[PDB]
């Protein structure tokens, strides 16, 4: 644990809280090891709760997003020259743990190359659980700490699937109090119906495309649309133009 401690990052400004990063092996058979980043709260704030933050994709890095351009302690400089401190970082009130998941994402890796062509919700969750159970062994002063799980987007799946596991596990050192999801997947049918309605309601697609989308995708999964849905979706993409679909009214990077 002390071994996982970070002294300083390049370009990092001086701070008053500790930080830790390293790997946990969740599958010795396969050689699957997840990388974490813990940004603690300041001493005075202790002992604060422990928050596991997960990014979506599927396939996107919690360190890459959560820690670096969202709620983490620092922001990266242009050209990747150094770090700047985040005035609104969440680790002001809690101990934030960022997990790169699944194996093959970010700094997280697998020793079984096949591993990356066969990921799914089930194994992602089981590895995530394993990671937590050993993480508490590496960091025993964290046992019994109120714990919360949070995430965005495809983590609408991750967060509740993992919470479910944690809960049914009945592990006595994990004091799960709850979870929070931002902009995430909940129910395929309803999300599709709502996505299209909001698009038409924001002037981003035509009346026809809107109708084609509803008729092409309602029986589909978000993750595995049919060819009719893809066709529909390709027209819409062309009606949307060169916009940041993740933030309708802000500029696109050049």
């Amino acid at each position: 644990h002390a071994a996982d401690r970070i002294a300083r990052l390049p370009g990092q400004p001086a701070v008053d809280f500790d930080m830790y990063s390293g790997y946990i092996t969740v599958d010795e058979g396969a050689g699957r090891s997840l990388f974490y980043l813990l940004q603690e709260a300041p001493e005075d704030a202790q002992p604060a709760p422990l928050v596991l933050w997960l990014n979506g994709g599927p396939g996107c890095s919690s360190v890459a997003y959560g820690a670096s351009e969202e709620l983490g302690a620092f922001r990266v400089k242009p050209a990747g020259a150094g770090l700047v401190l985040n005035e609104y970082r969440w680790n002001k009130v809690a101990n934030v743990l960022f997990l790169d998941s699944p194996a093959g994402v970010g700094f997280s890796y697998t020793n079984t190359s096949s591993d990356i062509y066969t990921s799914g919700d089930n194994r992602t969750a089981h590895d995530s659980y394993a990671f937590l159970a050993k993480w508490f062994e590496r960091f025993p002063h964290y046992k019994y700490r109120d714990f919360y799980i949070a995430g965005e987007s495809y983590a609408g799946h991750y967060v509740p699937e993992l919470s479910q596991l944690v809960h049914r596990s009945k592990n006595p050192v994990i004091n799960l109090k709850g979870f929070m999801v931002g902009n995430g997947l909940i129910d395929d049918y309803h999300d599709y119906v709502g996505t299209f309605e909001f698009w038409w309601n924001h002037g981003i697609v035509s009346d026809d495309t809107y109708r084609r989308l509803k008729e092409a995708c309602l029986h589909d999964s978000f993750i595995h649309p049919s060819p009719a849905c893809d066709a529909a979706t390709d027209v819409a993409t062309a009606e949307q133009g060169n916009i940041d679909m993740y933030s309708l009214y802000t500029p696109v990077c050049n």
């Binding site: 300083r8 990052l9 390049p10 990063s21 980043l37 709760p49 396939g59 890095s61 890459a64 997003y65 351009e69 709620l71 990266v76 400089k77 050209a79 990747g80 020259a81 609104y88 969440w90 009130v93 809690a94 093959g104 970010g106 700094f107 990356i116 062509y117 066969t118 990921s119 799914g120 089930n122 919360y148 965005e152 987007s153 609408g156 799946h157 919470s163 799960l176 709850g178 979870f179 929070m180 999801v181 931002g182 902009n183 995430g184 997947l185 909940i186 129910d187 049918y189 309803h190 999300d191 599709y192 709502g194 909001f198 595995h224 679909m245 993740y246 933030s247 309708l248 990077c253 050049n254």
Partner: protein, 152 residues
């Protein structure tokens, strides 16, 4: 001030050995590929995924867990209306109807408290809430840690 180019910077940064050294990452240098923000392969080779999370919410609400759901109102990828319909389909009862929450003297977003779950939207924020509305995003977080309803 917002810079829509952040992923670029991150790509450059995490790719330095300096940094990886500092993070205790790719220690043996054995990661036979450049560092990326997401993994394409992974992304395009996903298998199992249920169609609904509704059943799980039900189980965890019944379990008594604290559950908050939030939404940046200018995201178009997983938009606010998608979340309104999906949460609406849990059929929970309403404890406090849709109301405006403030941060200072500005409206931070809207909120609805149901029996077992709290719905919060963030005004003017895109998909990555803490990036677009950092300040309002910290408020959001603090109230949830407390289990207190959005203010004002």
């Amino acid at each position: 001030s917002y810079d829509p180019c952040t992923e670029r910077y991150s790509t450059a940064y995490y790719n330095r050995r300096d940094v990886q050294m500092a993070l205790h990452a790719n220690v043996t240098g054995a990661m036979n590929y450049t560092w990326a923000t997401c993994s394409d392969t992974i992304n395009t080779h996903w298998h199992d995924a249920p169609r609904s999370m509704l059943p799980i919410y039900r189980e965890l609400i019944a379990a008594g867990l604290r559950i908050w759901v939030f939404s940046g109102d200018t995201d178009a990828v997983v938009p606010l209306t998608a979340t309104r319909y999906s949460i609406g389909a849990l059929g929970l009862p309403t404890t406090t109807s849709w109301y405006p929450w403030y941060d200072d003297q500005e409206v931070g977003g809207w909120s609805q408290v149901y029996k077992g779950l709290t719905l919060v939207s963030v005004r003017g924020a895109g998909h990555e809430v803490p990036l677009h509305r950092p300040r309002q995003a910290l408020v959001l977080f603090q109230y949830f840690l407390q289990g207190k309803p959005m203010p004002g």
